[PDB]
GROMACS .gro file of C-alpha atoms in nm:
model
  180
    1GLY     CA    1   0.819  -2.126  -2.818
    2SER     CA    2   0.570  -1.899  -2.961
    3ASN     CA    3   0.302  -1.733  -2.756
    4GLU     CA    4   0.502  -1.808  -2.462
    5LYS     CA    5   0.462  -1.418  -2.337
    6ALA     CA    6   0.163  -1.223  -2.299
    7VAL     CA    7   0.097  -0.833  -2.240
    8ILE     CA    8  -0.094  -0.809  -1.877
    9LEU     CA    9  -0.071  -0.409  -1.887
   10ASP     CA   10   0.001  -0.210  -2.191
   11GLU     CA   11   0.074   0.120  -2.153
   12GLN     CA   12  -0.298   0.257  -2.102
   13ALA     CA   13  -0.376   0.020  -1.855
   14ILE     CA   14  -0.073   0.088  -1.665
   15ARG     CA   15  -0.161   0.489  -1.644
   16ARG     CA   16  -0.516   0.390  -1.556
   17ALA     CA   17  -0.423   0.149  -1.274
   18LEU     CA   18  -0.187   0.432  -1.137
   19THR     CA   19  -0.447   0.676  -1.168
   20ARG     CA   20  -0.670   0.436  -0.994
   21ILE     CA   21  -0.450   0.383  -0.684
   22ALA     CA   22  -0.397   0.734  -0.665
   23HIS     CA   23  -0.783   0.804  -0.646
   24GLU     CA   24  -0.780   0.524  -0.391
   25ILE     CA   25  -0.500   0.614  -0.156
   26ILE     CA   26  -0.668   0.975  -0.114
   27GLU     CA   27  -1.008   0.811  -0.031
   28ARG     CA   28  -0.916   0.558   0.198
   29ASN     CA   29  -0.686   0.813   0.361
   30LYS     CA   30  -0.938   1.100   0.342
   31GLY     CA   31  -0.680   1.314   0.183
   32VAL     CA   32  -0.308   1.282   0.159
   33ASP     CA   33  -0.218   1.460   0.500
   34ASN     CA   34   0.060   1.277   0.674
   35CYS     CA   35   0.101   1.047   0.385
   36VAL     CA   36   0.440   0.944   0.241
   37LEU     CA   37   0.510   0.701  -0.049
   38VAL     CA   38   0.799   0.501  -0.052
   39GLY     CA   39   0.914   0.272  -0.373
   40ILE     CA   40   1.039  -0.058  -0.324
   41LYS     CA   41   1.269  -0.181  -0.633
   42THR     CA   42   1.383   0.010  -0.883
   43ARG     CA   43   1.069   0.028  -1.055
   44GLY     CA   44   0.855   0.027  -0.754
   45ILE     CA   45   1.030   0.383  -0.706
   46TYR     CA   46   0.990   0.529  -1.042
   47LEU     CA   47   0.586   0.396  -0.970
   48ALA     CA   48   0.593   0.552  -0.645
   49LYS     CA   49   0.717   0.907  -0.819
   50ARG     CA   50   0.438   0.888  -1.095
   51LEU     CA   51   0.194   0.806  -0.836
   52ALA     CA   52   0.294   1.135  -0.626
   53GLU     CA   53   0.260   1.325  -0.911
   54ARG     CA   54  -0.062   1.189  -0.979
   55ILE     CA   55  -0.190   1.245  -0.658
   56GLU     CA   56  -0.078   1.588  -0.631
   57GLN     CA   57  -0.263   1.665  -0.970
   58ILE     CA   58  -0.567   1.556  -0.772
   59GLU     CA   59  -0.500   1.693  -0.454
   60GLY     CA   60  -0.296   2.021  -0.534
   61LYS     CA   61  -0.032   1.901  -0.238
   62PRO     CA   62   0.277   1.747  -0.293
   63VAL     CA   63   0.349   1.388  -0.150
   64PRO     CA   64   0.707   1.288  -0.053
   65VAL     CA   65   0.854   1.016  -0.215
   66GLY     CA   66   1.131   0.798  -0.055
   67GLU     CA   67   1.303   0.475  -0.172
   68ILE     CA   68   1.424   0.143  -0.045
   69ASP     CA   69   1.713  -0.018  -0.234
   70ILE     CA   70   1.653  -0.380  -0.242
   71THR     CA   71   1.838  -0.661  -0.435
   72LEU     CA   72   1.692  -1.005  -0.434
   73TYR     CA   73   1.893  -1.310  -0.375
   74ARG     CA   74   1.835  -1.701  -0.354
   75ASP     CA   75   2.021  -1.936  -0.144
   76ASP     CA   76   2.070  -2.186  -0.379
   77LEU     CA   77   2.148  -2.274  -0.745
   78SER     CA   78   1.803  -2.295  -0.893
   79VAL     CA   79   1.684  -2.060  -1.172
   80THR     CA   80   1.378  -1.942  -1.034
   81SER     CA   81   1.252  -1.595  -0.876
   82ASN     CA   82   1.513  -1.465  -0.647
   83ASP     CA   83   1.315  -1.470  -0.302
   84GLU     CA   84   1.570  -1.323  -0.052
   85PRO     CA   85   1.548  -0.914  -0.012
   86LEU     CA   86   1.894  -0.763   0.082
   87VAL     CA   87   1.826  -0.422   0.179
   88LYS     CA   88   2.090  -0.193   0.025
   89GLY     CA   89   2.005   0.141   0.128
   90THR     CA   90   1.703   0.407   0.190
   91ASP     CA   91   1.651   0.747   0.138
   92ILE     CA   92   1.358   0.892   0.278
   93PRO     CA   93   1.341   1.273   0.229
   94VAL     CA   94   1.099   1.312   0.559
   95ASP     CA   95   1.043   1.166   0.905
   96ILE     CA   96   0.769   0.883   0.880
   97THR     CA   97   0.691   0.855   1.269
   98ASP     CA   98   0.281   0.881   1.291
   99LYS     CA   99   0.272   0.909   0.936
  100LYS     CA  100   0.125   0.647   0.716
  101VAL     CA  101   0.356   0.513   0.475
  102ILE     CA  102   0.232   0.393   0.143
  103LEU     CA  103   0.476   0.072   0.003
  104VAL     CA  104   0.479   0.078  -0.345
  105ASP     CA  105   0.584  -0.259  -0.523
  106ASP     CA  106   0.547  -0.311  -0.906
  107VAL     CA  107   0.458  -0.688  -0.872
  108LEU     CA  108   0.311  -0.844  -0.551
  109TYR     CA  109   0.435  -1.202  -0.556
  110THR     CA  110   0.593  -1.370  -0.250
  111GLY     CA  111   0.567  -1.072  -0.012
  112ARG     CA  112   0.918  -1.114   0.088
  113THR     CA  113   1.042  -0.788  -0.071
  114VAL     CA  114   0.746  -0.616   0.116
  115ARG     CA  115   0.877  -0.753   0.448
  116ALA     CA  116   1.194  -0.633   0.421
  117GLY     CA  117   1.036  -0.291   0.311
  118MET     CA  118   0.829  -0.282   0.640
  119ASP     CA  119   1.119  -0.363   0.858
  120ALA     CA  120   1.388  -0.080   0.662
  121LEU     CA  121   1.099   0.156   0.772
  122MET     CA  122   1.057   0.035   1.114
  123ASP     CA  123   1.469   0.085   1.111
  124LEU     CA  124   1.379   0.481   1.044
  125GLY     CA  125   1.103   0.530   1.239
  126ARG     CA  126   0.746   0.440   1.373
  127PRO     CA  127   0.464   0.518   1.127
  128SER     CA  128   0.118   0.536   1.227
  129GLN     CA  129   0.049   0.275   0.939
  130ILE     CA  130   0.224   0.096   0.628
  131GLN     CA  131   0.000   0.055   0.334
  132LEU     CA  132   0.085  -0.126   0.037
  133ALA     CA  133   0.001  -0.034  -0.327
  134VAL     CA  134   0.097  -0.263  -0.597
  135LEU     CA  135   0.056  -0.246  -0.968
  136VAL     CA  136   0.040  -0.604  -0.995
  137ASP     CA  137  -0.070  -0.874  -0.773
  138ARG     CA  138   0.046  -1.231  -0.910
  139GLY     CA  139  -0.052  -1.435  -0.598
  140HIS     CA  140   0.149  -1.701  -0.456
  141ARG     CA  141   0.251  -1.520  -0.145
  142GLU     CA  142   0.472  -1.677   0.064
  143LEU     CA  143   0.430  -1.466   0.363
  144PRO     CA  144   0.076  -1.337   0.532
  145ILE     CA  145   0.101  -0.987   0.320
  146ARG     CA  146  -0.189  -0.842   0.135
  147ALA     CA  147  -0.182  -0.531  -0.071
  148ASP     CA  148  -0.406  -0.278   0.009
  149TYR     CA  149  -0.410  -0.123  -0.325
  150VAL     CA  150  -0.396  -0.348  -0.660
  151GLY     CA  151  -0.356  -0.219  -1.011
  152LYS     CA  152  -0.449  -0.563  -1.115
  153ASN     CA  153  -0.485  -0.909  -1.006
  154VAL     CA  154  -0.283  -1.124  -1.263
  155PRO     CA  155  -0.331  -1.539  -1.163
  156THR     CA  156  -0.021  -1.699  -1.229
  157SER     CA  157   0.188  -2.002  -1.184
  158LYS     CA  158   0.521  -2.060  -1.033
  159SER     CA  159   0.679  -2.132  -1.347
  160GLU     CA  160   0.565  -1.777  -1.499
  161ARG     CA  161   0.754  -1.469  -1.447
  162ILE     CA  162   0.635  -1.100  -1.507
  163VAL     CA  163   0.843  -0.862  -1.662
  164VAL     CA  164   0.755  -0.500  -1.577
  165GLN     CA  165   0.905  -0.224  -1.825
  166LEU     CA  166   0.867   0.150  -1.778
  167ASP     CA  167   0.996   0.456  -1.972
  168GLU     CA  168   1.244   0.546  -1.694
  169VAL     CA  169   1.479   0.221  -1.675
  170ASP     CA  170   1.336   0.035  -2.036
  171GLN     CA  171   1.232   0.306  -2.256
  172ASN     CA  172   0.858   0.166  -2.292
  173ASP     CA  173   0.585   0.125  -2.074
  174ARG     CA  174   0.445  -0.244  -2.050
  175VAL     CA  175   0.375  -0.549  -1.806
  176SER     CA  176   0.404  -0.863  -1.946
  177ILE     CA  177   0.377  -1.255  -1.827
  178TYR     CA  178   0.641  -1.491  -1.988
  179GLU     CA  179   0.664  -1.884  -1.942
  180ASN     CA  180   0.949  -1.997  -1.785
   0.00000   0.00000   0.00000
């Protein structure tokens, strides 16, 4: 059909949300001493790296960035969003024990990737807090998870999927919502 996709973050809205999140992290943590950013999912990781650069531009101190590499699966033959995270690997360049780790997710949906992210962190260390920054929160949580920082709330139905494009993997910055 026609009009079965819409842009929910254009490039400027992306850049503004990141900048907002950067400020929010700084205000809430009262600086970024002992903060570590950790990206989840391929685009969450690129977002995390943008976020750390933005925070560095604000504070003049680097923020370390790590990644948790997760692939999502389903237990059935349905075509519907994959909801089972499998953690493939981790790379965090610093110790996270007694640090505030900020998980960075492109789209908060079921919360299921976030939960695997939290456990993955707990396998590497004992942070004092795990916080969650997300570019989009589309609701329909399946676990009791919520974001500390949200670029945009986007109401959705379970039939819709959110497509995130970023320059680093997709050669354009855009978030879109699609029926089906």
